[PDB]
């Protein structure tokens, strides 16, 4: 990736751990069946104001050794390309080629 595209995601990860409690709490008012409709609106209002990048939805899982946005695999944290190169070198434990 571009170094900025990597940087954008560090920031996002920082901004999600920061506001998790607050966001989650707000959201858990825009919901509560036996809440107040008036207070419901105030919860909606505060969640418009929190940094957008504090939404976890706004994170794109990226390759840890490069920063490839596509082709990701969660188990490893790498793109296909890096998963493979790691596996072949014997650097992912347990993971070999498979036939059946």
């Amino acid at each position: 990736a571009k170094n900025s595209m990597k940087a954008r995601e560090a920031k996002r990860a920082k901004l999600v751990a920061k506001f998790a409690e607050k966001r989650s709490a707000l959201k858990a008012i825009i919901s509560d069946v036996n809440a107040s409709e008036e207070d419901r609106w105030n919860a909606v209002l505060k969640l418009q104001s929190l940094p957008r990048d504090s939404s976890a939805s706004r994170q794109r899982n990226r390759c840890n050794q490069t920063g490839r946005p596509h082709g990701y695999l969660r188990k490893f944290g790498l793109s296909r390309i890096k998963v493979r190169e790691a596996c072949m070198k014997g650097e992912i434990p347990g993971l070999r080629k498979a036939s059946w």
Binding site: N64, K75, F76, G77, G90, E91, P93, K97
Partner: protein
Amino acid sequence: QKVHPNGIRLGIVKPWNATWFANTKDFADNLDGDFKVRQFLTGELKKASLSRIVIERPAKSIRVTIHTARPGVVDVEKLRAAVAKIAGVPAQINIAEVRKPELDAQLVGDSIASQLERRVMFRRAMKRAVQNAMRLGAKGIKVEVSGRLGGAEIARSEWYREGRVPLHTLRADIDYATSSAHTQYGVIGIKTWIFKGEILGGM
């Protein structure tokens, strides 16, 4: 075209460079840790003849093994302390001598890589390696240097093979390694294969 020699033989005759059980959560972190450790150790042990960093994780720790031609050059406290930092877990570091360091594909390529960065004849470097190996008792060896060779405007790929290198035989104990000589013309790849005899009986 061709499968990775270490890849296909993992489990058959080729051990793993990483041995730790993780559940999915940890698995991807452990992997990123290992990369940082490797990237660090490699970047520090540039003039220590490094081949292979084996990263165990015995419970909540990280044991490294710098297999090296130069246990002397390896300092160790600083490495141990540095790894322990990156991993964030009480790290050990063990050392293993590569006894015959010219029958190690990684070093052999690293050698040729250095030599090509110092402006040596690619045929000279390639050929000396083949001979040293076949003398020290390689059952065979291939070396393929690929790039702008002697700074040619067109990239080509020359390779010399002596002995057997039976890549389709899985019981064959083949050591493979890519190196890269970075030069004024560009990158120059050094693939090295070294056949050290079929292992009957499995891993």
